[PDB]
C-alpha cells in the first residue's frame with residue numbers, strides 16, 4: 089500500500105480514546121471564531137423554533153397556566169370556552185352571558201399549545217395475519233416517505249427545479265434503489281442512472297458542475313451482491329459501469345457524486361475512485377465527487393489520501409463531508425463480528441468533533457478539493473461558515489441538505505444578504521423514484537429524525553434551551569473528560585464487541 093492508504097487501514101478500528109484525543113485540537117475553534125459561531129448558530133436555531141412564534145406563544149400559554157393555578161387539562165378547556173365565547177357576534181351579548189350566567193371541537197388544536205388501540209391491534213392482527221402487517225408496513229412507508237421524495241421520475245423532479253434554483257439552490261438527484269441482488273437488478277439501475285444523466289445534463293444546459301445540477305450514485309446499485317463482492321469481480325464488472333456513467337456526466341459537464349455506504353465498502357470504493365481519476369477522457373475535468381463520513385475513525389486519513397489523489401491526478405475533487413447515515417447498522421454489524429472495536433464513534437458528540445476537524449482539513453486545500461458540507465445542524469453550519477474565513481467566493485465551498493429536511497434552516501442561508509440571508513449556496517439532495525425503491529432510504533430517514541441525539545429532533549424539543557442545542561462539541565468533549573477521567577471514552581451503553 090501507499091503511505092496514505094496504509095494509514096487508512098491502520099486507523100480502521102482505532103480505540104475511541106485515542107481517536108477523539110487526536111482530533112480535539114484539530115476541531116477546536118479559536119475563541120473569537122467560536123464566539124461568532126455560537127451567536128450565528130443561536131440565531132439560526134432561534135428562527136427555526138420560533139417560526140410562527142412557537143416560543144412566544146408557549147410563553148403566554150404557561151403565563152396563564154400560572155396566574156390562575158390551572159392545570160394543563162384545565163388550560164385547554166378554558167380556551168375552548170373562550171373560543172366559543174369569541175364566536176358570539178355581538179359583544180353586549182357575549183359580555184352579558186359571561187356576567188349573568190357563567191364545545192370542545194378544536195380542543196386538540198389548543199392542546200398542541202400545551203390504551204384501547206392495543207385491543208384494536210390485537211384483534212385486527214390475529215384476524216388478518218401477516219398480509220395485514222405487510223400492507224400496513226408498505227402503506228406507512230409510502231405515507232411517511234412522500235415528504236422525502238422529489239418526484240417519481242427524473243422528468244418530474246427536474247420540472248420542479250427552477251423554483252429553488254432561481255433562489256440560488258442547486259440540486260443533486262438520487263435515483264432511489266440500492267443493494268442490487270441480481271444481475272438484472274443492477275442492469276436496471278444502470279439504465280436508470282444513464283437515463284437520469286441524459287435528463288439532468290440536458291436540463292443543466294451547460295451551467296456546469298458548480299451552478300448546475302448533478303447526480304448521486306450508489307455503487308451497491310451497480311453490482312449484484314456488492315456487500316460481499318470481491319475485488320476482481322468489482323473491477324471487471326462494476327468499474328466499466330462507473331466509468332461509463334462518469335464519461336457521460338463529463339460530456340454534459342455535470343457533477344457525478346459517489347455516495348458513501350457501509351464501512352466495509354470504503355476500501356473498494358477508494359480503489360474504484362483511484363482508477364477513475366486517471367482515465368484520460370476525464371483529464372482536466374473536476375466533476376468527480378466523493379462522499380466521506382465523519383463518523384468513521386478513518387475519515388481524516390481518507391482526507392489525506394484524497395488530497396494526495398487530487399494532486400497526483402491533477403484535478404479538484406468535489407468532496408461531500410457528511411456525518412453518516414448507517415450508524416445503527418454499523419454498531420450492530422460490529423457487535424456481531426466480535427472484532428477489537430467499532431469503525432464508527434459511539435457518542436454523537438465525537439462525530440461532531442470529527443466533522444469539524446475534517447472540515448478544517450478540507451478548507452485548507454481549495455486548489456485540490458471543493459468541499460460540500462452536508463448538514464441540517466445549525467451549529468455545524470455556523471461553525472463551517474466561520475471556519476471558511478473571510479472573503480468567501482462561490483467556488484470556495486457549498487452547503488448541502490436532504491429534500492424535506494433542509495428547507496427551514498437553509499431558507500436563512502441561501503439568498504441575498506439584503507433579504508437577511510447569509511448568501512451561501514446549498515445543494516439539495518433529491519431522491520427520485522416510486523414506492524418500490526423507497527424502503528431503505530425512508531428507514532434511514534426515520535432513524536435520523538427519530539434519534540434523540542439528532543439536531544432535528546432536539547430542536548423540536550422546546551424544553552431544551554437554545555444554548556445547549558448549539559453547544560460547542562469540543563467543549564462538550566472536554567466536559568465529559570473532566571467528569572469521567574479521560575478524553576474520548578466510549579458510550580457507556582455501547583461496550584466493545586468482545587465485552
Ligand SMILES: Cc1cc2nc3c(=O)[nH]c(=O)nc-3n(C[C@H](O)[C@H](O)[C@H](O)COP(=O)(O)OP(=O)(O)OC[C@H]3O[C@@H](n4cnc5c(N)ncnc54)[C@H](O)[C@@H]3O)c2cc1C
Pocket residue numbers: 346347348349379381383408410411412413414415432433434435436437438439462463464465468488489490515516517536539541542543544579
Ligand atoms: C445532502 C446530504 C447527502 C448525504 N450523503 C450521505 C452518504 O452518501 N452516505 C452517508 O453515510 N451519509 C450521508 N449523509 C448524511 C446522513 O444522511 C445524515 O443526514 C447526517 O449524518 C446527519 O447529520 P446532521 O449534521 O444534519 O445531524 P446531526 O444531528 O448534527 O448529527 C446526526 C448524526 O450523528 C451521527 N450519530 C448519531 N448518533 C451517534 C452516536 N451515538 N455516536 C456517533 N455518531 C452518532 C450519525 O451520523 C447521525 O446521522 C448525507 C447528508 C446530506 C444532507
